[PDB]
């Protein structure tokens, strides 16, 4: 078909960068992060919507791999929060080992420039996002260390309230959007160059974050509220604020977010959501955020990671221009990451103060006095 050859051409010219894939959690579920001697299975998986052969087949340009861990279920909330931090390092570890062990397929990327170099070398640009601020165990220091480990976006919540923001699916509301610590954290996220992800967060938390952020944000995997009313879908008001923020809504393939009857969800529904957003806030603010492996079964025509060429062709068939399809595929999310870097470099260049954790005093006043007396002793030498 001429439209399919057009789709293949676009997939070679620019990278389709998917916003959110849960394959690392499937590796934890199926292999318990032990991939030694499992190459055959990683290329042809016995479960799930992602493997290395189908990843090649669908011509995907890049991927934000999710380092998700569940919300803590421990009654002792101190243990559970700290446990989630340890589990986050487990998931970041298996993501890096997966990339390290398959360099012909995957190449780690943490920037707009590294996405392009990976794509030009014929690799799936492999980026990392965490899914919920419960994963940092109330530690901004840990957050900066996750950034150093390669994390480039943070979903502010998963399906639990945390100290910083309200999740969409949990009622009643804790903070009524963002907490005071959450508002302060947005400044630090902008300063460090961590992309803000508003998927899973409440409607009000989105509104507040979209007004406060000095850098463009994403919805890594959310769909459109006006086409399907759900707590996880983006309202017209928040789409309007996203436009002003310069951010990108990355349309999700979750059946429950695309249709009232999940079994009726299709490729066409995903395209309707992309076109709705593109028409109303411009095709420079819409992306693709599958959430493959966040579900058992995908929509008809989008069953797994091999199906991306059908989506690209489907957009072209509806009359979306090549230039706008290229934007939706990946240029938009690349721009957001680029602008996130630039805002961080500007704030770091100006010398903005970083947010610091509240620590206990380790020394009493007697120890401090001994130290000051000692310092004066060496001064008099």
- Site for a copy of itself, rule CB under 8 A: 28-30, 32-34, 36-37, 45-49, 76, 78-79, 82-83, 85-86, 89-90, 92-94, 96-97, 137, 139, 141-142, 144-145, 148-149, 296-297, 303-304, 353-354, 356-357, 359, 361-363, 367-368, 370-372, 374-375, 377-378, 381
The nearer residue to a copy of itself, 38 or 226, going by C-beta atoms, is 38
The nearer residue to a copy of itself, 11 or 137, going by C-beta atoms, is 137
**CB of residue 139 to a copy of itself, shortest distance in Å:** 6
**CB of residue 174 to a copy of itself, shortest distance in Å:** 22
What are phi and psi for residue 8, nearest 5 degrees? -60, -40
The nearer residue to a copy of itself, 40 or 375, going by C-beta atoms, is 375
**CB of residue 200 to a copy of itself, shortest distance in Å:** 19
DSSP state of 89: H
Q: What dihedral angle (degrees, nearest 10) is formed by the CA atoms of 115, 309, 200, 202? A: 110
The nearer residue to a copy of itself, 35 or 231, going by C-beta atoms, is 35
**CB of residue 170 to a copy of itself, shortest distance in Å:** 21
DSSP string for 325-361: HHIIIIIHHHHHHHHHHHHHHHHHHHTPPPP------
| Cis amide bond preceding 144, omega within 30 | no
The nearer residue to a copy of itself, 204 or 352, going by C-beta atoms, is 352
Residue 77 C-beta-side C-alpha neighbours within 13 Å: 6
- The kind and range of the H/E element at 127 are strand 124-131
**CB of residue 26 to a copy of itself, shortest distance in Å:** 8
Distance CA 164, CA 226 (A): 27
Distance CA 79, CA 337 (A): 34
The nearer residue to a copy of itself, 45 or 209, going by C-beta atoms, is 45
**CB of residue 111 to a copy of itself, shortest distance in Å:** 17
Burial class (CB in 10 A: 0-12, 13-18, 19+), 143: buried
Question: At which residue do the structure tokens 């986050």 appear?
Answer: 88
**CB of residue 165 to a copy of itself, shortest distance in Å:** 20
The H helix count followed by the E strand count for the chain is 16, 9
DSSP state of 140: H
HEC string of 238-257? HHHHHHHHCCEEEECCCHHH
**CB of residue 149 to a copy of itself, shortest distance in Å:** 6
* Nearest to 156, CA basis, from 185, 176, 187: 185
**CB of residue 380 to a copy of itself, shortest distance in Å:** 11
The nearer residue to a copy of itself, 23 or 283, going by C-beta atoms, is 23
Tokens at 7, concatenated:
């789709």
The nearer residue to a copy of itself, 254 or 277, going by C-beta atoms, is 254
Residue 99 makes CB contacts below 8 A (sequence gap 6+) with: 106, 107, 108, 126
- The kind and range of the H/E element at 141 are helix 140-148
Q: What is the CA radius of gyration of the chain?
A: 22
**CB of residue 356 to a copy of itself, shortest distance in Å:** 4
End-to-end CA distance of the chain: 86
The nearer residue to a copy of itself, 78 or 323, going by C-beta atoms, is 78
DSSP state of 151: E
The nearer residue to a copy of itself, 5 or 78, going by C-beta atoms, is 78
Distance CA 163, CA 179 (A): 7
């Amino acid at each position: 078909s001429p439209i399919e050859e057009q789709a293949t051409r676009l997939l070679k010219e620019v990278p389709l960068i998917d916003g959110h894939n849960n394959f690392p959690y499937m590796i934890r579920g199926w292999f318990r992060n032990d991939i030694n001697g499992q190459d055959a299975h990683l290329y042809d998986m016995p479960i799930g919507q992602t493997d290395l052969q189908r990843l090649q087949k669908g011509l995907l340009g890049g991927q934000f791999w999710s380092a998700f861990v569940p919300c803590p279920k421990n009654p002792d909330k101190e243990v559970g929060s700290l446990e989630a931090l340890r589990q986050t390092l487990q998931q970041l570890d298996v993501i890096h080992r997966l990339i390290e062990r398959h360099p012909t397929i995957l190449q780690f990327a943490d920037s707009a420039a590294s996405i392009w170099s990976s794509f030009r070398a014929g690799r799936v640009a492999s980026l990392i996002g965490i899914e919920g601020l419960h994963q940092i165990a109330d530690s901004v220091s840990a957050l900066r260390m996750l950034h150093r480990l390669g994390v480039r976006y943070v979903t502010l919540t998963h399906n639990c309230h945390n100290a910083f923001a309200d999740a969409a699916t949990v009622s009643p509301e804790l903070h009524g959007g963002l907490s005071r610590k959450g508002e302060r954290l947005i400044r630090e996220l902008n300063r460090m160059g961590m992309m803000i992800d508003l998927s899973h967060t409440s409607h009000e938390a989105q509104t507040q974050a979209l007004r406060l952020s000095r850098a463009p944000v994403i919805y890594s995997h959310s769909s459109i509220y006006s086409l399907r009313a759900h707590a996880r879908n983006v309202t017209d008001e928040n789409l309007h604020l996203l436009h002003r923020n310069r951010g990108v809504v990355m349309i999700c393939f979750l059946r429950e977010l695309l249709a009232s009857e999940a079994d009726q969800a299709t490729l066409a529904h995903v395209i309707d959501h992309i076109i709705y957003a593109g028409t109303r806030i411009g095709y420079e603010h819409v992306g693709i955020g599958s959430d493959f492996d966040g579900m058992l079964r995908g929509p008809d025509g989008l069953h797994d990671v091999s199906c991306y060429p059908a989506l690209v062709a489907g957009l072209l068939e509806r009359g979306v221009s090549e230039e706008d399809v290229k934007r939706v595929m990946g240029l938009n999310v690349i721009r957001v990451l680029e602008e996130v870097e630039r805002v961080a470099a500007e704030l770091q260049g100006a010398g903005e103060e970083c947010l610091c954790d509240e620590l206990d005093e380790v020394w009493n006043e007697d120890i401090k006095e001994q130290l000051t007396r000692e310092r004066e002793r060496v001064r008099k030498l």
